[PDB]
């Protein structure tokens, strides 16, 4: 009649303590989306063409400027060599953000679930909910919980 299993308790820390501060993760998701937003910020007015350079302006607008916009010309050199490489750095930092976000965006949102069971999160303190309050909690994990 030891039919109590405290796995509910291990999940009682987990079930809805995430929602008690549901907006901690959204602040971090804003930070993760910030690189998406800041990339969107830098792709707003002049790089608005980049949204269609990827599809339509690919073979048209890149090469016409190199001749027509200088044949018409010959106060137009200073800022282009400083910001675009930073924009290229942003693209370099975006693909690596996406690789990170493919393995980090789940982390911040999920980690609010172990907020209260941060002991269950951290290695040196998950034992209490896996050993101490577990002489019935380990029943579902009977093979694991000897």
């Amino acid at each position: 009649r030891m039919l109590e299993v405290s796995r509910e308790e291990a999940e009682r820390k987990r079930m809805l303590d995430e929602r008690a501060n549901y907006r901690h993760k959204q602040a971090l998701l804003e930070a993760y989306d910030q690189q998406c937003d800041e990339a969107t910020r830098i792709f707003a007015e002049y790089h608005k063409r980049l949204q269609v350079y990827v599809n339509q302006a690919n073979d048209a607008q890149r090469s016409v400027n190199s001749s027509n916009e200088v044949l018409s010309s010959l106060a137009t050199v200073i800022p282009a060599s400083e910001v675009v490489v930073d924009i290229s750095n942003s693209a370099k930092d975006f693909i690596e953000k996406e690789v990170s976000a493919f393995f980090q965006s789940p982390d911040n949102s999920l980690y609010m679930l172990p907020a209260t069971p941060q002991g269950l999160a951290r290695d040196p303190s998950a034992i209490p909910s896996i050993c101490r309050i577990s002489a019935a909690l380990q029943y579902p994990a009977g093979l694991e919980g000897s």
Partner: protein
Amino acid sequence: GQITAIEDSLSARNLQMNGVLGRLASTSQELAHYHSGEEDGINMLGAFSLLKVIESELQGYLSATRSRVGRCSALIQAASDVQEQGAVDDRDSFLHGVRDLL
């Protein structure tokens, strides 16, 4: 459920910026050129103004990579609850130490 939705937007924005990784040099001189012809016939606003955003973009990128230090903070909760059975039985092994009182 919401973990995949944000990643879907991430993956979509990752896959529609696929070419920009090697097609972002198009603005290196077009930004300069598409002002040059008009002013000198007889665009700098995007170039100058955006330089401010990159510093904010870098700081936003800094938090993206700074969280990689915390990449092992969330998934461990399900992982630690299982893989630590060596110490789990150890703490209940001293329990077994009590029972064999002889």
